[PDB]
Structures are given as structure tokens and as C-alpha cells.
Design a protein around this ligand. Structure first.
Ligand code: CL
Ligand code: CL
Ligand code: CL
Lengths: 157, 157
């Protein structure tokens, strides 16, 4: 049982989808994410190359590894913003950028914003020879996929 | 044009291929690798999950990111061993682990060994809960794909 954060987005060379479901147990446990027991849910940011996509050398539909994905959550009526740092991981259904999440502000409607940064300069490279290499270059400022009316009503499991 | 290092290998949950071709211009230029002009060739390790990889949650046949790949080159009859750190990068045909390399002891027959370590502890995780998790785990001892008789006969371009 998976529930959408909202409609999938196409931003630059990325096809971005967001879903949430029950908390999971991850090994190792990433950064400062809540445990399966402490968490409200698990949120997955699925990032696959789109047609644009190919200019960086990826095949359409391929998972795009080495990205740095963060989510910002803001409950409607509040000035507070919660930052969620996803981590790369595999589940039984494949790779994702994911995070166990506890909604600090509780039940309500949220603005949910994913910021997707390209790999760090020392973490990835592109072959750029004329004619034989790729023509595209990684984006400089993080790409954004946003949903303005995400409803968190508590566990649906 | 790509030239083979030797026969493809299946090691653990990985299918590993090795090819070499003319040195390339990479952006950013990775680690301490030689430039396109200084290098003898580019060596590429192609790594995809095999059937055993499904247990780690990878899609069978897909690229396996976040690994730490190092190549060791040793000319027959020599005690000198060159250590080459590979870096993740994209070419027109997708992601691979690779490096521009100089064959330090010149033309001849070399033993070529790729040692493939799992992702560092803080760089990747697996879901391990019953509902969404996997039953496999990352390997502790690095996996080895090696070719005892690679012939460096000079550029084929
Ligand atoms: Cl926000
Ligand atoms: Cl060796
Ligand atoms: Cl480690």
C-alpha cells in the first residue's frame, strides 16, 4: 500500500515521483531519521531520467544515482518549515531516495517541496569529448518538484 | 571503439565487464587521473546486478551505483603493482566506473584486477523490515574480477 504525495513532475532531465507509506527499518539507519517505531511514515522520492535525460548519458527510465535530495515541509497556517534529508537506499522494489519522517507540526495540509541537487563536483564526472561525449551538463541550482496541498491525516495502514 | 580487457565475470551479485579505449576528457576531471593527453587509455568497469542481485533489491541487469572500485595492474615478471581508483561517470552509453590510466611499465602482458567494495557505511542503506525489505546484504570482503593475461600492445586508435 503506497500513497501519492501528488502528481509526478518532470523537471529538467528528471521524472520525479513522491509517495509515502508505513515507516520502514533501514540498515544502516540514515543520518538523523526517526526509527521505524518513532516515525509517522516513510516518504520516497523516485527519480528517473526523462527524455532530456539522454543528454547527460542516461537511458530514459533509469534511476539517477548520486543526487542530493532534500524535502521541505510547511503546514498550511504555519511559518515553520521542517527539512527532511533523504538518503539513497534499496527496498524490495528497487532503489529510491527515501526517509522515515515524523511530521513535527502534526495532522494537516502541507506544502511539500523536493530540492534535487546534482552530484557534488568530486563525486561524478561526464565524458565531454567532442562528438563522442555527452552534450548536457549537470544543473547548477537544485531542481524543484513541489506539491502545495499534501494532506497528512495519520497512518493509512 | 571499445576493446575488451577479457571475458566478462559474474562475482557475487555482480556481472562485471572490462573494456578499454582511447583516453577521454572528463568534466570535472576525476581525482588524480591523468589527462586525455598524458593517459595511455581509459579503462571502464561495467557493473550490473545479476540474478543474485535481486536479493539486495537491485533490478536485475541495472547499473549498481555507489560502489568503490579500484583496479590493480601488474606487469608479468614485475613486483610493481599500480593502484588505480576508478570514479563513477557517464559516457554516451550510460554510467560506469572508470579511469584514464597509464600502463607504467610499458607494453606487455599485465594481470588486471578490479576490487569492488560495497558502498561505504554512511552512503547507502537497505530496507530490512519484513514488509518492504530485502533478505540480502552487502558483501564485506571486496569482490574480485580479474584477468591474468591482459595484453597492452599500445593504442588501437
Ligand atoms: Cl516549503
Ligand atoms: Cl595484482
Ligand atoms: Cl565503510
Amino acid at each position: 500500500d503506497e500513497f501519492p504525495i501528488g502528481e509526478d513532475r518532470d523537471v529538467g532531465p528528471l521524472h520525479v515521483g513522491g509517495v509515502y507509506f508505513q515507516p520502514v527499518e533501514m540498515h544502516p539507519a540514515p543520518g538523523a531519521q526517526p526509527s521505524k517505531e518513532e516515525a509517522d511514515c516513510h516518504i520516497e522520492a523516485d527519480i528517473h531520467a526523462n527524455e532530456a535525460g539522454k543528454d547527460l548519458g542516461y537511458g530514459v527510465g533509469d534511476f539517477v544515482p548520486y543526487l542530493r535530495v532534500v524535502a521541505f515541509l510547511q503546514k498550511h497556517g504555519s511559518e515553520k518549515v521542517q527539512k527532511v534529508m533523504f538518503a539513497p537506499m534499496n527496498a524490495g522494489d528497487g532503489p529510491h531516495y527515501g526517509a522515515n519522517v515524523k511530521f513535527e507540526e502534526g495532522l494537516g495540509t502541507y506544502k511539500v517541496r523536493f530540492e534535487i541537487a546534482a552530484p557534488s563536483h568530486d563525486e561524478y564526472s561526464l565524458h565531454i569529448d567532442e562528438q563522442t561525449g555527452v552534450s548536457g551538463r549537470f544543473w547548477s541550482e537544485p531542481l524543484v518538484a513541489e506539491w502545495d496541498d499534501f494532506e497528512w491525516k495519520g497512518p493509512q495502514w
